[PDB]
Amino acid sequence: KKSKKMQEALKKVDATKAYSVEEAVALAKDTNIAKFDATVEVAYKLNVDPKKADQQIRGAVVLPNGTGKTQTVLVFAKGEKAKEAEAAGADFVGDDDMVAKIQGGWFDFDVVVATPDMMATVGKLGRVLGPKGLMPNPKTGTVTMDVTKAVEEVKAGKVTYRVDKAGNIHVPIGKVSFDNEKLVENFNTINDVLLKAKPSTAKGQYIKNISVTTTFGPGIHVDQAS
Amino acid sequence: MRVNITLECTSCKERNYLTNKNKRNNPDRLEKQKYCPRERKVTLHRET
Amino acid sequence: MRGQKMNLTFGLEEVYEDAEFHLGDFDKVGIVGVNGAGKTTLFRLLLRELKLDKGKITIGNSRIGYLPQEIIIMDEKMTVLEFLAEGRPIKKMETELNYIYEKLTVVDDDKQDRLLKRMGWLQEQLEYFDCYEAESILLDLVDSMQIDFDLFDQPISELSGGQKSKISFAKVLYSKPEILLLDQPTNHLDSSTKEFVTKYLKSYRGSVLIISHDIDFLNQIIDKIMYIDKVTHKISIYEGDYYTYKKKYSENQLLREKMIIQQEKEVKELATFVQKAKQASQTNHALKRMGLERAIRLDKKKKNLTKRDKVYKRVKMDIKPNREVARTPLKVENVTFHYPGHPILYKDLSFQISGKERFLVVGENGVGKSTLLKLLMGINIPDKGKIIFNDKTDVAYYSQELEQLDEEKTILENVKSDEYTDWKLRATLSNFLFYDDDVNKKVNVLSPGEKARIVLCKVLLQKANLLILDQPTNHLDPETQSIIGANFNLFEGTIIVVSHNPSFVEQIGINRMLILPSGNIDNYSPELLEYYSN
RNA sequence: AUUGAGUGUUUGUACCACAUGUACAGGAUAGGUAGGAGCCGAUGAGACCGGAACGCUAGUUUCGGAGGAGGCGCUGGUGGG
Ligand SMILES: Nc1ncnc2c1ncn2[C@@H]1O[C@H](COP(=O)(O)OP(=O)(O)OP(=O)(O)O)[C@@H](O)[C@H]1O
Ligand SMILES: Nc1ncnc2c1ncn2[C@@H]1O[C@H](COP(=O)(O)OP(=O)(O)OP(=O)(O)O)[C@@H](O)[C@H]1O
Ligand SMILES: [Mg+2]
Ligand SMILES: [Mg+2]
Ligand SMILES: [Zn+2]
């Protein structure tokens, strides 16, 4: 069912033990034996079922230490505001008509933003950015008058989150090479934003499970009260 | 079947009037323009 | 789904009186009741279209898929694809979302907060109803009921009754609902199409309430049966199938009848003694004393004596022709017809009816059955050929979709005829269960079943010798169907009938069947099944 | 309640093992989401042969035999994915 490396990694993990965040992250630094700088994932099994409209959860958080990987920012801007995006460090900024170039080109880029009324034009390309997840959603903070802040935050390592219809939310908190202190700080930031994002109509226990996992290692259950 | 009814004010919902109707001759809810003492104005009143 | 102390009274005729019902989740409930019992009204309460005069009706927050008893065609020019697409709110939200973008450009810093929230919800809502459905619907038609794509671009109003029922059923499924409220989902379907619907409803994991007058169809699906009583204005919920409901119900009414019998005997006994004392000599003091004492018991008895519910009256039909049939009522010779822009339905169609004959126009959905009957009456002019009616033949037409009633006028106004006086009209409407001021009701507020009786009454009042009936038993409660079939059997005239109900055709006793689209004038027999198979 | 042991049968619940995912297009059986350029293998790979299960009849999954070292993915087009 598993290779010896995963079997060996399994021996270092207790299936029935809920680890503290301090222990789990440090253990993750030993269960990331994959032959590359694997990412570290956190999965919360919220009790909310997104089938109900008021139960849906979506947004983004500016991770304090970032994920350690650059994000390519595409900015739809009007007037001199476009130069503001370039000054803020936008990877590439497009006019109203550059959507045609994006259509069939300039793919393999990470995020899109509107400033903010450009959405009247971005709607045409929404069917392309939509299913790919690139559609600028105000709930995620990709649409705003403060494009100068939006651009620089993304370069700082803003990571989006979205509960799937099954009732899970996954987010990359950083690379396995990160110091546990920095890694813990990112993990805690994710915890706070989710609690702040708890829907007002939630009932019962909110976080039914937290699991830490590497790109290749096993999941590690952790205590939300720790 | 003659029955007693109340005519509510369609504006403020005050049950302002006691009257009666024959349900056979007036199946639908009786509607009248009656003075509402709350709003101090003539308003449409409907049986509730 | 739960309802408490339900009350609802349209004018003077009441529907529910202190009615109650509790439906557990994941219950395939079969709703049964005579025409007018209030089965459709229950769904309107669930859909919040209606409000109870008194009481509380409780519904779960889950999304509900509703299949109306009547097709909702907002505009005549609506296409089938437009009709189906309206099942999902994708188009509606996009039109709203497109306007939101317009407002964002116009408004700079005033309404942005409100607009941004509205935009976000629409995107999240749109993704929840994944916009990939455009492709799924196209193939949902194929896998559902073999609905051809040529219909997909055709106006919905031009479809046949059976075809429309397929589209409406598919639309409900297209919406991806959580609770299924099906109001006669197989009203016009043929035998083959009914098979698919049954299998899907058997497999459907969720809760599904079915209003149906088809006992066999329900028995295969129903696990709980809800009976809407027309006389007690109440709701009773049984566990089991239609037969179990009939068995439990028949026993309960039997046990109730016996109770009222014994209470009457005791009242008669006291009454008989009270009278004996009443007529005794005034000099018999003790008997007079005992007579008054029993008069007190007699009074208390008569005040606790349960009233037997008046058994709901069944329809009485006496259809007789004014004149006599000929040996050749109808002559059809070399008749060809095609709807402009569509393939020819039949070529050189030629048949000849014999008189006092049961003529069945067999076929499948969308094969030309209703077109042929419309052809005879004169609604459709034949592209080729001739249709000749003998001067001795009077014709009465029962259309499939109930297109012979004025929704704006009342029941009495619809049946008004130059040949019938007022009391004559009322007497027949009472035979069709329209009593007293029930005939002044607008046709627009009647149920499909009650409207079918008015159409039948129009056919009866003609006293024609040829009956062109297009699915007569549709919308009728099972009891009224058997009455319809039995009375037609005794009709002393020619009957051209179309019916997908196997029971109804057996009662009429068909003589010759005309198969479509392959024109085959054949003697009626269980070989009808052979044609259905082939 | 005093009132405690079991067995068996039928049931409610929760983990735990297993297996299931074929709309049309599309390499063809892509169930959802995230990470993902790497992943697996003489701890005996691909291919081959036989048994078994599923099956929408296309194929998918699993066990064993022989053999001994190689394969899969990224890149590529299709698609809402
Ligand atoms: N006004 C019309 N315009 C264009 N096409 C029509 C029109 N009426 C019917 N058609 C087509 O004629 C075909 C058959 O006509 P018809 O209405 O008689 O079906 P049917 O025999 O009554 O089937 P069923 O009653 O079981 O639904 C249908 O495919 C239908 O699409
Ligand atoms: N606005 C109204 N005004 C007067 N009477 C009404 C009104 N609405 C409904 N009724 C009556 O309510 C009664 C029962 O309602 P409902 O239409 O739901 O019966 P039904 O069981 O669904 O009919 P069917 O089974 O034949 O389809 C009808 O007889 C109808 O005449
Ligand atoms: Mg109804
Ligand atoms: Mg027809
Ligand atoms: Zn008032």
PDB file of N, CA and C in Angstrom, chain C residues 303-346:
ATOM      1  N   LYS C 303     -76.545  14.462  22.336  1.00  0.00           N
ATOM      2  CA  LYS C 303     -75.537  15.506  22.274  1.00  0.00           C
ATOM      3  C   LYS C 303     -74.116  14.960  22.174  1.00  0.00           C
ATOM      4  N   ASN C 304     -73.917  13.660  22.410  1.00  0.00           N
ATOM      5  CA  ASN C 304     -72.622  13.007  22.249  1.00  0.00           C
ATOM      6  C   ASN C 304     -72.635  11.977  21.123  1.00  0.00           C
ATOM      7  N   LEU C 305     -73.603  12.069  20.217  1.00  0.00           N
ATOM      8  CA  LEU C 305     -73.807  11.073  19.169  1.00  0.00           C
ATOM      9  C   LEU C 305     -73.026  11.493  17.928  1.00  0.00           C
ATOM     10  N   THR C 306     -71.987  10.731  17.595  1.00  0.00           N
ATOM     11  CA  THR C 306     -71.124  11.097  16.478  1.00  0.00           C
ATOM     12  C   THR C 306     -71.914  11.118  15.176  1.00  0.00           C
ATOM     13  N   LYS C 307     -71.687  12.155  14.377  1.00  0.00           N
ATOM     14  CA  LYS C 307     -72.276  12.228  13.049  1.00  0.00           C
ATOM     15  C   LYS C 307     -71.454  11.409  12.063  1.00  0.00           C
ATOM     16  N   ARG C 308     -72.133  10.576  11.279  1.00  0.00           N
ATOM     17  CA  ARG C 308     -71.465   9.861  10.202  1.00  0.00           C
ATOM     18  C   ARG C 308     -71.130  10.829   9.075  1.00  0.00           C
ATOM     19  N   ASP C 309     -69.863  10.844   8.669  1.00  0.00           N
ATOM     20  CA  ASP C 309     -69.449  11.707   7.573  1.00  0.00           C
ATOM     21  C   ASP C 309     -70.190  11.325   6.301  1.00  0.00           C
ATOM     22  N   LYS C 310     -70.702  12.330   5.600  1.00  0.00           N
ATOM     23  CA  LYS C 310     -71.403  12.081   4.349  1.00  0.00           C
ATOM     24  C   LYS C 310     -70.438  11.515   3.318  1.00  0.00           C
ATOM     25  N   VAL C 311     -70.726  10.302   2.847  1.00  0.00           N
ATOM     26  CA  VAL C 311     -69.847   9.651   1.885  1.00  0.00           C
ATOM     27  C   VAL C 311     -69.789  10.484   0.615  1.00  0.00           C
ATOM     28  N   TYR C 312     -68.575  10.719   0.122  1.00  0.00           N
ATOM     29  CA  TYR C 312     -68.398  11.561  -1.052  1.00  0.00           C
ATOM     30  C   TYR C 312     -69.085  10.935  -2.257  1.00  0.00           C
ATOM     31  N   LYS C 313     -69.911  11.725  -2.937  1.00  0.00           N
ATOM     32  CA  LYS C 313     -70.727  11.215  -4.024  1.00  0.00           C
ATOM     33  C   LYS C 313     -69.893  11.026  -5.283  1.00  0.00           C
ATOM     34  N   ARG C 314     -70.157   9.935  -5.994  1.00  0.00           N
ATOM     35  CA  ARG C 314     -69.438   9.607  -7.213  1.00  0.00           C
ATOM     36  C   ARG C 314     -70.169  10.149  -8.434  1.00  0.00           C
ATOM     37  N   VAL C 315     -69.411  10.332  -9.515  1.00  0.00           N
ATOM     38  CA  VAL C 315     -69.971  10.914 -10.726  1.00  0.00           C
ATOM     39  C   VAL C 315     -70.980   9.955 -11.343  1.00  0.00           C
ATOM     40  N   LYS C 316     -72.025  10.521 -11.941  1.00  0.00           N
ATOM     41  CA  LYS C 316     -73.030   9.765 -12.679  1.00  0.00           C
ATOM     42  C   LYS C 316     -73.105  10.320 -14.093  1.00  0.00           C
ATOM     43  N   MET C 317     -72.794   9.480 -15.077  1.00  0.00           N
ATOM     44  CA  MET C 317     -72.808   9.871 -16.480  1.00  0.00           C
ATOM     45  C   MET C 317     -73.829   9.028 -17.225  1.00  0.00           C
ATOM     46  N   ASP C 318     -74.692   9.689 -17.995  1.00  0.00           N
ATOM     47  CA  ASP C 318     -75.654   9.023 -18.871  1.00  0.00           C
ATOM     48  C   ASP C 318     -75.552   9.690 -20.242  1.00  0.00           C
ATOM     49  N   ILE C 319     -74.601   9.234 -21.050  1.00  0.00           N
ATOM     50  CA  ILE C 319     -74.372   9.803 -22.373  1.00  0.00           C
ATOM     51  C   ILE C 319     -75.198   9.016 -23.380  1.00  0.00           C
ATOM     52  N   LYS C 320     -76.106   9.707 -24.066  1.00  0.00           N
ATOM     53  CA  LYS C 320     -76.933   9.103 -25.094  1.00  0.00           C
ATOM     54  C   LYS C 320     -76.926   9.980 -26.337  1.00  0.00           C
ATOM     55  N   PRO C 321     -76.884   9.389 -27.530  1.00  0.00           N
ATOM     56  CA  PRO C 321     -76.904  10.197 -28.750  1.00  0.00           C
ATOM     57  C   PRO C 321     -78.317  10.624 -29.109  1.00  0.00           C
ATOM     58  N   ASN C 322     -78.445  11.868 -29.571  1.00  0.00           N
ATOM     59  CA  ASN C 322     -79.743  12.342 -30.037  1.00  0.00           C
ATOM     60  C   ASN C 322     -80.182  11.588 -31.283  1.00  0.00           C
ATOM     61  N   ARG C 323     -79.309  11.504 -32.281  1.00  0.00           N
ATOM     62  CA  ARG C 323     -79.593  10.831 -33.538  1.00  0.00           C
ATOM     63  C   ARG C 323     -78.853   9.496 -33.586  1.00  0.00           C
ATOM     64  N   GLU C 324     -78.986   8.808 -34.714  1.00  0.00           N
ATOM     65  CA  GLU C 324     -78.478   7.454 -34.878  1.00  0.00           C
ATOM     66  C   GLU C 324     -77.252   7.454 -35.781  1.00  0.00           C
ATOM     67  N   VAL C 325     -76.343   6.524 -35.511  1.00  0.00           N
ATOM     68  CA  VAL C 325     -75.120   6.399 -36.293  1.00  0.00           C
ATOM     69  C   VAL C 325     -75.435   5.755 -37.637  1.00  0.00           C
ATOM     70  N   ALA C 326     -74.614   6.064 -38.633  1.00  0.00           N
ATOM     71  CA  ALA C 326     -74.683   5.433 -39.942  1.00  0.00           C
ATOM     72  C   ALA C 326     -73.627   4.338 -40.053  1.00  0.00           C
ATOM     73  N   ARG C 327     -73.729   3.546 -41.123  1.00  0.00           N
ATOM     74  CA  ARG C 327     -72.716   2.531 -41.379  1.00  0.00           C
ATOM     75  C   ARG C 327     -71.364   3.139 -41.729  1.00  0.00           C
ATOM     76  N   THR C 328     -71.338   4.397 -42.169  1.00  0.00           N
ATOM     77  CA  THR C 328     -70.099   5.110 -42.483  1.00  0.00           C
ATOM     78  C   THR C 328     -70.151   6.471 -41.810  1.00  0.00           C
ATOM     79  N   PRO C 329     -69.891   6.533 -40.505  1.00  0.00           N
ATOM     80  CA  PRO C 329     -69.886   7.848 -39.841  1.00  0.00           C
ATOM     81  C   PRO C 329     -68.844   8.790 -40.416  1.00  0.00           C
ATOM     82  N   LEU C 330     -67.611   8.315 -40.580  1.00  0.00           N
ATOM     83  CA  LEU C 330     -66.486   9.149 -40.979  1.00  0.00           C
ATOM     84  C   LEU C 330     -65.726   8.484 -42.117  1.00  0.00           C
ATOM     85  N   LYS C 331     -65.437   9.256 -43.164  1.00  0.00           N
ATOM     86  CA  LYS C 331     -64.664   8.792 -44.310  1.00  0.00           C
ATOM     87  C   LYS C 331     -63.385   9.610 -44.402  1.00  0.00           C
ATOM     88  N   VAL C 332     -62.243   8.948 -44.247  1.00  0.00           N
ATOM     89  CA  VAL C 332     -60.932   9.558 -44.450  1.00  0.00           C
ATOM     90  C   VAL C 332     -60.278   8.856 -45.627  1.00  0.00           C
ATOM     91  N   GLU C 333     -59.885   9.628 -46.639  1.00  0.00           N
ATOM     92  CA  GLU C 333     -59.351   9.069 -47.876  1.00  0.00           C
ATOM     93  C   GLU C 333     -58.114   9.845 -48.295  1.00  0.00           C
ATOM     94  N   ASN C 334     -56.978   9.152 -48.361  1.00  0.00           N
ATOM     95  CA  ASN C 334     -55.747   9.699 -48.930  1.00  0.00           C
ATOM     96  C   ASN C 334     -55.401  11.052 -48.316  1.00  0.00           C
ATOM     97  N   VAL C 335     -55.409  11.106 -46.989  1.00  0.00           N
ATOM     98  CA  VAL C 335     -55.149  12.335 -46.249  1.00  0.00           C
ATOM     99  C   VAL C 335     -53.681  12.364 -45.847  1.00  0.00           C
ATOM    100  N   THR C 336     -52.973  13.400 -46.291  1.00  0.00           N
ATOM    101  CA  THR C 336     -51.600  13.666 -45.887  1.00  0.00           C
ATOM    102  C   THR C 336     -51.548  15.007 -45.168  1.00  0.00           C
ATOM    103  N   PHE C 337     -50.698  15.097 -44.149  1.00  0.00           N
ATOM    104  CA  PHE C 337     -50.589  16.321 -43.369  1.00  0.00           C
ATOM    105  C   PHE C 337     -49.190  16.438 -42.787  1.00  0.00           C
ATOM    106  N   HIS C 338     -48.661  17.659 -42.796  1.00  0.00           N
ATOM    107  CA  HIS C 338     -47.381  17.970 -42.181  1.00  0.00           C
ATOM    108  C   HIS C 338     -47.451  19.362 -41.575  1.00  0.00           C
ATOM    109  N   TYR C 339     -46.879  19.518 -40.392  1.00  0.00           N
ATOM    110  CA  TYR C 339     -46.777  20.843 -39.798  1.00  0.00           C
ATOM    111  C   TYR C 339     -45.683  21.627 -40.515  1.00  0.00           C
ATOM    112  N   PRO C 340     -45.974  22.839 -41.027  1.00  0.00           N
ATOM    113  CA  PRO C 340     -44.985  23.547 -41.855  1.00  0.00           C
ATOM    114  C   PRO C 340     -43.577  23.504 -41.283  1.00  0.00           C
ATOM    115  N   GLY C 341     -42.660  22.880 -42.014  1.00  0.00           N
ATOM    116  CA  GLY C 341     -41.279  22.782 -41.600  1.00  0.00           C
ATOM    117  C   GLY C 341     -40.892  21.492 -40.911  1.00  0.00           C
ATOM    118  N   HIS C 342     -41.755  20.485 -40.913  1.00  0.00           N
ATOM    119  CA  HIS C 342     -41.501  19.240 -40.207  1.00  0.00           C
ATOM    120  C   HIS C 342     -41.863  18.066 -41.104  1.00  0.00           C
ATOM    121  N   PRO C 343     -41.343  16.874 -40.806  1.00  0.00           N
ATOM    122  CA  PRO C 343     -41.620  15.715 -41.663  1.00  0.00           C
ATOM    123  C   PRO C 343     -43.102  15.369 -41.689  1.00  0.00           C
ATOM    124  N   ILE C 344     -43.533  14.791 -42.812  1.00  0.00           N
ATOM    125  CA  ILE C 344     -44.924  14.384 -42.954  1.00  0.00           C
ATOM    126  C   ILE C 344     -45.240  13.312 -41.922  1.00  0.00           C
ATOM    127  N   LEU C 345     -46.325  13.518 -41.173  1.00  0.00           N
ATOM    128  CA  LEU C 345     -46.706  12.558 -40.141  1.00  0.00           C
ATOM    129  C   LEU C 345     -47.290  11.288 -40.749  1.00  0.00           C
ATOM    130  N   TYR C 346     -48.177  11.429 -41.731  1.00  0.00           N
ATOM    131  CA  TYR C 346     -48.743  10.283 -42.425  1.00  0.00           C
ATOM    132  C   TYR C 346     -48.999  10.662 -43.875  1.00  0.00           C
TER     133      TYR C 346
END
